[PDB]
Recover the amino acids of this structure.
């Protein structure tokens, strides 16, 4: 009956409201994806319940055990009906779940503390003084792992063997590491997040260079779900009607602190 | 069964080679989409034949007869098996054909002569000295017709009724009009095309402002087609390897002349 929506606490997509302890259900949350879920639900005419993914992950398959974790796993094992989050559309995931056309276009980017003498991935790969890493679990880390491109593979060899770990548990942890490193740590992350952080106090970070790749976030459903076709059409209509642009402005720039 | 691929002569996607005279079949052509087609066909193990769409159109449904024209129509009526071209993923099209995930992300942009006192969509809609239009039977013309945004509607109420017609049956005709207008005509077109033209001699055009929207091009197949799922995974695979980026640079800037 009620559509179970799995999502992840990742600002500004989904965040706990200030007085969330005084609220119940969907009203406890706010964000880009909270607004998008309400809109998809209104347009497709269904009732839903937002639930935060238990393990706080996006979705990877463990080799050997072959088990899918994160939001992807919730869909694959039937714990949720749909995933509305900054979940990257990838080949390995499309083999086990369905994705709508992209509701957001992005690429891997470089975040630096202002003043850091780095302007590109080639720059990072060629030097050793400034450390760099990615979100430990996700498509960004997998991009570097699977890349046959020289600069990116060179970057991976270093990241995989770096001690202590250059990988981080959450975006917030990567941003704090960039902010506290005196420019000795650069962070590789999804471009839209890099832009978001660039508009947050203390306004000491910035995106440098072009994006390393091009991809998109999609709404996900279990293969052969009855919700799949409907939701894909909703994303296309919402995009055409300009809602996706408006939501980005609201959560990124209208709220900008710099 | 040899796959009939429908496409469109639009540079640098599909162009007849300089020496097409002594060549035959798929050999007469070169381009971004020619390379892409060979890639998909290689990775999915099928034989194909490139055919240029009969009416030279992208695809739109006649409001009276309800009949689909262009590349979309060839797929809908079963005249072709797959469409590999700069075809925009839209809602109305997704209702009658299948689209893979985008092989290229883009948006509507402004092309000016050079020296033209226009720096944005607002600028265009505030004046009448400079004429402006779009292509036809395309997603660009439709974007302005359906736009509820104050500025874009202001532009359409002018374009729609603008005599002499500011619309062009072909991209080449739009670019030619900008070039021979003495700066009195600005053209609204898709960003990747605008960027390509800016790198072509006489090097007298320029893209100004940011994109008015965000969309993507996808490889299209008729609904129910078994080639659809395969080709989608093929697009994701190719993009992930960095091939689409490789093909973008090759045809856009390695071959640039400015
Ligand atoms: N979108 C990713 C998760 N994810 C998120 C952020 I924000 C980032 O910087 N890198 C990632 O891999 C996925 O889907 O795994
Ligand atoms: N991609 C469009 C066609 N198309 C093409 C170009 I190049 C442009 O500038 N505008 C369009 O509508 C479609 O698929 O209709
Ligand atoms: Zn709505
Ligand atoms: Zn290949
Ligand atoms: Zn008619």
């Amino acid at each position: 009956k009620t559509v179970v929506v799995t999502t992840i606490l990742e600002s500004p997509y989904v965040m706990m409201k200030k007085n969330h302890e005084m609220l119940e259900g969907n009203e406890r949350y706010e964000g880009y994806c909270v607004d998008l879920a309400a809109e998809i639900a209104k347009h497709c005419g269904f009732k839903y319940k937002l639930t935060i993914v238990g393990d706080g992950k996006y979705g990877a398959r463990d080799a050997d055990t072959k088990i899918w974790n994160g939001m992807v796993g919730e869909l694959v094992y039937g714990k949720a009906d749909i995933a509305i989050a900054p979940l990257t559309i990838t080949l390995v995931r499309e083999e086990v779940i369905d994705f709508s056309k992209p509701f957001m276009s992005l690429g891997i980017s470089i975040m630096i503390k202002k003043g850091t003498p780095i302007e590109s991935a080639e720059d990072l790969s060629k030097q050793t003084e400034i450390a760099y890493g990615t979100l430990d679990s996700g498509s960004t880390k997998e991009f570097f792992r699977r890349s046959k491109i020289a600069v990116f593979d060179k970057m991976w060899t270093y990241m995989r063997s770096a001690e202590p770990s250059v990988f981080v548990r959450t975006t917030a942890e990567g941003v704090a590491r960039v902010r506290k490193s005196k420019g000795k740590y650069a962070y590789l992350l999804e471009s839209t997040m890099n832009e978001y952080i660039e508009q947050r106090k203390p306004c000491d970070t910035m995106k440098v260079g072009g994006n390393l790749d091009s991809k998109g976030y999609g709404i996900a459903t279990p293969k052969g779900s009855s919700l799949g076709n409907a939701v894909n059409l909703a994303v296309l209509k919402l995009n055409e009607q300009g809602l996706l642009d408006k939501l980005k402005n609201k959560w990124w720039y209208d709220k900008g602190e710099c």
User: Anything to note?
Assistant: The radius of gyration of chain A is 18 Å. The domain at 107-215 of chain A is CATH 3.40.190.10 (D-Maltodextrin-Binding Protein; domain 2). Chain A touches chain B at residues 89-91, 94-95, 99, 101-102, 105, 143, 146-149, 213-216, 218, 232-233, 236-237, 239-242, 244-245 (CB under 8 Å). Chain A has two domains: 107-215, 1-106+216-255.
